[PDB]
């Protein structure tokens, strides 16, 4: 639901209101109804209520970085002039109620209304499309309440205690109602430990297996050792959900919502999040979280730490005066010392604060903020940067609680002024990369259900390690999760756990870990053999909804948006015009991603082993020399111009710990000899199309992981697939392929198998790796080609061939004005015929 | 001054002893004025009988367990607190529960004195083991609301007289909420939804009637200061 | 399944409708076509509503309730 | 009152329309005591005014 | 830097700025100069933010600029806690009238003040009343002197538009409780008591200036008349003989302000139009109505008319005869969506206005005026607002520091003038030299009791608030005080916009842009990407064609909606038609085929 | 144990327009809700009398000044809003305030008709110099709560009428306190003390009686059940 102002709704629905006014005889003609609406007569408000009912409206807030920026809501009239927005969607819209505006659009046609009511409804978009994690979940205030409600504190009024002489158990209640009655009298605190008999809350599975070996049913009473607040919280969850009994940190709430998403339909999730919102607001009101300087505690160890580090700063100054240091080195040493001082002050402040202090309670619960802000507010501001972006040796030892001095404030203003321009400039590079990604993969749509391919990629789930418990792989949640199995998974006894083609959800991964199987084979977009687009089974689970992708999904644009949205968090090239070229220092961020997607030769190139064999290594004044002798092969291979500045690759086995690559080591084909970035073209030449795609995906995901961004591998795979779709012809046999021309691999294989009159006389060709730009700069459609290339040449070539265009390019359809060939626009659904059944029609 | 429209009270049945009452339309702001008062009146005004102490013969200080029965003393106390008892005595009354031999002992096995009625004889109390027996005496007296177990620190005539919490009020759970409704072109009017779950000894309708009577009774004191002072009228 | 009564345009539940169509995209066109038929009938060869209509329910709501009621059939256009 | 005391870098004979890069619109140390570092419009003239 | 009575430094090392702008510590014998005062770096506006130490640079910037957007209220009120600059800035602005020469106030009135100087000269100061500023705000002045009073040279004798007693009064000081409340202040929203609406605390007067003129045309000169064609007497009842709305009449959107008619060209009536002329006896006339009307969503009372005409030798643009300007004034109260903010950069929008009985109230029964969420203070690093709250509470209720056993150790630095003060005693705290944390903490515990003799706020600045709705006391004390907040010029009344159908641009055929032109909202390429990602083909198609430059489809859809017909299907836009025609002109046999290899269609 | 003891209410004066009412004994936890309900009723729904519109001879709208008057019309209206009056008839009544020559015009210069009383004549309306002539006609009506100014077009009144905000509320400030009682040996029952201060129109006793009557009428709905 959303609140829609009366005056705005009236203008939006004017024609409908006029129709209804004429229908009800309040106006004798369209002109009279128009005059009535314009002059806002008393009666129009009675018809507006009838018209507005059940008519969804789209809400949007530019810029629209991801598809959830436009969402449909059911409008209801409200007084005043400000739109009322549901809090849970703020995160989706990136909106705060401090002056933001929002735009409203009205679907007109029946198809548009159905699309808004089904595809775009807010309650249907709980999960983010980038990683499938819930997005419309409790936040800020709602967390603080739920964190307060479920907290357990020792010594609370009426808390449980054991039996004693002349006294049975003193804190046991016969039902939640009795506990609430006791709380109303002040005898019991909502956060006190109690033992309560629950009969409608399902016991924890481990407790259920013991207490009820025949399975728990409603009405079965069990004694739970918990707090009244936790019982109250657990009543908000679905009835069948096991009792949790835990303090609801934001991470725990995210876990619970994720679990609900898998096991229950979306409607139950929406109702649960609404109930959580209500309870969180109610208990955040009464959590007592307030701010005053009495609550802003300053650690008593700040003085000692500051003088202790001032002594070392004075030592640095003394050594500089003696001539043992240079200016820049002295500045760097002082920066190191004061960073250490700030770190220790932050640790002391974190230790000092009580667990129930509002300032630190707001942070620790995950509701808002981070400990750096708390340290700045109370501990000390720390170091600040020059206009050039370099740290000033002398830090701001004061804290905003104490109040900065004049000079400290003046030097602090530099970074504040810089950030305003930095934030504005950060969006340009992100938009550039996002446009590139959208261009390369706009028309990648799911065209068929199953391609019936046996190929796939191997993904690792865990390492059984040295202990008796295997450790879950950290990358499992974005590599194996949400895939579809290509082959059966068998336990240590050969028993099949999950069938082929099943979705590897969280329960599936947990069961796989229960059997201790470490690696599996999953179908991937990279290995999909579908001629056009990709098939649903290879793509697998839809991140936004959790079900298998429907035929017609616009997966390519979704992947492009998901990859491009977090581009602002990556590090970038320096924005200053002066200075030397920035390639000397590795800016491993958006520049690295751009380098990877464009398939350009890395500026930090490192060689790879063309042949598997043992290594003989030599050193020179400034160059390395690495030779590989193939153990099972013949002639050796030599690399004799590797710069000695680059370090040799480190291997570092668990306990062997070889460290830097040594002579006599063994290297397999595709291994990297020098630290740096492997050349994608060399990898393609040595290993082939399969390994270069894996290499590209690994390299991109490495940067995105290191920079703190979480994106599922399939989104990157969708983009990487488009880069390696052509094969260059070196020599043609019994077919009309011109030499040196680029042909689609599908057409190349099709022609090679079509040449059958004399069997096969294959034309020789090999795959070519292209950047996303060049890949996007080609198409099979002449109407689309006429918008990029010389229109006269394209039209002439199409005319002489008399070839037709099938309207599949999406970008081509918008020129025609014909609806896009994705989602509801594909012919599979556009031509649906609807007829009532004979048994249902009999009632007529 | 006449009210804009007379509010109405509708009822819905949610279970055998649970109901939901809707009061609407109310003048803007009166929903919260009525809801909390009704809830507190329901939970603290209606008198009723409850068990205030139980004495088991088989235990002096080993409260953890009682021989001949698998239930803990805590479980016995909880089950007895779940007992629904009514009386017309207005004074403490002693009730004896004695059973022998293996098998389930329930509230129906009780032998109430004259004037005392047990409304849920089918409630399970305990499961007696072989060679086992149960013998307890309960003190039942009337009251209002919820009174935490009174500690008989001065008890010299007995040491095994366990005190227990007394749920006197026949109403067990009440929860209220306030929503907005629209009459004419105004949407400030309030609607009060109050859900009441009561014991078996009284229906929710009777509890609400008694609460309303008590509240009218109490505000009559304020009204009688000057009965002719103009109020909003219905 | 256990769930509170849906409110507004959430009735009938979305999952129950997806269980009665090939996909959400197919469901959109299915409901839109039925709503168009209902509106055309109300404008006066289409059958008209099959379920009891509300006071002023829109054609699309009637179509969705009919779909949920298993009162309609459709053939894939492919 | 604050409009009458503005110091505008943009205008004829000042700096070019398209050359107002992020470098000029910054707090130089010499601003101390003669130009306030805090007060400036939120519009596109941040630092330029 | 601390110094002795003689001026000599009392420290061995002092902080200094050197050649490169670098701040360092140097011996006491190396300094050459010092700043005259701590306020040297800040400007006039930044000098008016109390406790500026404790606010981050970004939030200080935001507060300084938001102080420039405050709208004058009907009755100004000086802040309880402020800075000494607010006085001087008020006088130097010039909006306050200052007596030039010492004398006696001979006569005082709302319109003018007459002063008799000691030397016998007489001065007359005319006050400007309800004058419209360049931005639509009211510049009303009012006198602050009584007849027979003596005024010294340079003394303020009349308050300006937004000053009280000759000092800046940009906003109102009101009671604030720092706590979340049912989520109505969630995400920087603000909750207000209905009192602020009933007592006109935040009400402001806004004046709009409409304009029109009659120009010479190729068919002749336009005319201003009351006889505009085809309007009922219900429409022009409030028009004067000249055809201009009478002063004092209230107007609402669509009402006529100035009746104007323009000559028309050839008529060439259709047969239907001729029949209508016949059946109503419409005698021929050659004028068309173009009367000025109140814009959409505007109303108020007419307060003035200014009319010019070249026949009176007034200068007018070439080819224009008469010009009329009308002033419409309205009294806007505070409403939902209006933007409020403090001086420290904390800003929000009123999400809810609660009845007075619903607001949390102090133990003595006083209901709080505003509630600010706790979660917005810490992470924004603008804790100076809490300092302002505490010091405002200390100022509202007087304080008295005991001196029976000597001055308290925390009161050593306080000047004697601050050892006591009555209720409502305004205080000053300069930006870089003001109340310290220890002094404020000590003062918080020295406040005077209330009417009943009980202290509402404890030594920590917190109080035990009651719940207005439930009636139960809140479980923990809540920070309470007085904050100075001001009404920004971002009112929702002039930001709401809507459009179903309206004017269209001739150059590109698309809807116009902006609220003034009654334009539509933009639908950028990113929105198209989002719609494609949803798979909502039909919605995107209708957005790009029906709701855009497609005249035939637009008219068809409007007709279908008004007549109740189901929306007709779109297809074959004009651009594709002309492209196909050009392709044919190039001898390229283009044709459209249905299905996977079927026949042509249309 | 069950106690049949009944609650009772006793009042005590603090000033002319302020009083304190003590109700005891109450069931534990029952005091705060009753006090809050009484406070809400008193602050929201107590009938009163207020001004609805004014007419000044020399003005047509409130955005102007009257010759010889120090205050402009808006200041005069804001000052008049502080006037508290008591009326006897539901239908509107008219009052006249006319003065000439120099001097301070206060609410005591208003001449009310039969059945209308002004309870604060010392309030300052305006101040006139030697050239000041003031003529005002005020309309008074009965009502409850806050009623925003009615537009002239809605009421059909002619130009020159200046509608003003109406505040029908005699109550000024209400609070409550709760304590324990020495009831027999139960000793946990509640004692409620509600402190009421009203504008000079009516005494606190009448306001409390009106609130009690409203609450009795509203709880009669619940009492209706058998
Ligand atoms: Zn596939």
Author numbering:
A (entry chain D): 440 to 1283
B (entry chain B): 1 to 234
C (entry chain E): 24 to 67, 74 to 107
D (entry chain C): 440 to 488
E (entry chain C): 537 to 1138
F (entry chain A): 1 to 226
Give the original sentences from the paper that presented this experimental model.
Mycobacterial HelD is a transcription factor that recycles stalled RNAP by dissociating it from nucleic acids and, if present, from the antibiotic rifampicin. We show that HelD from Mycobacterium smegmatis forms a complex with RNAP associated with the primary sigma factor σA and transcription factor RbpA but not CarD. HelD associates with RNAP by penetrating the primary channel with its β′-clamp opening domain (CO-domain) and the secondary channel with its N-terminal (N-term) domain. Indeed, HelD was shown to remove stalled RNAPs from DNA, thereby recycling RNAP and the template for subsequent rounds of transcription.
The first class (hereafter us-fork–HelD–RPc-II), at an overall resolution 3.45 Å, visualized complete HelD bound to RNAP together with σAN-helix, σA2-4, both RbpA N- and C-terminal domains and the full us-fork promoter. According to the HelD configuration in the primary channel, the us-fork–HelD–RPc-II resembles the HelD–holo-II complex where both the HelD CO-domain and PCh-loop occupy the primary channel. However, in us-fork–HelD–RPc-II, the presence of the HelD CO-domain keeps the β′-clamp swung out and the primary channel widely open. As a consequence, a large gap opens between the β-lobe/protrusion and β′-clamp and the linker between σA3 and σA4 becomes disordered. Concomitantly, the σAN-helix, which binds along the β-lobe in the us-fork promoter σA–RNAP primary channel closed complex, is wrapped around the HelD CO-domain in us-fork–HelD–RPc-II. In us-fork–HelD–RPc-II, σAN-helix, wrapped around the HelD–CO domain, would also direct the σA N-terminal domain outside the primary channel, which is occupied by the HelD–CO domain itself. However, the σA N-terminal domain would be close to dwDNA where promoter nucleation occurs, and also close to β′-NCD. The us-fork–HelD–RPc structures show that HelD can dislodge rifampicin and DNA/RNA hybrid from the stalled early initiation RNAP complex while σA and RbpA remain on RNAP and keep contact with the DNA promoter outside RNAP. This process would correspond to backward transition from stalled early initiation transcription complex to us-fork–HelD–RPc-II (gray dashed line arrow toward Fig. 6b).
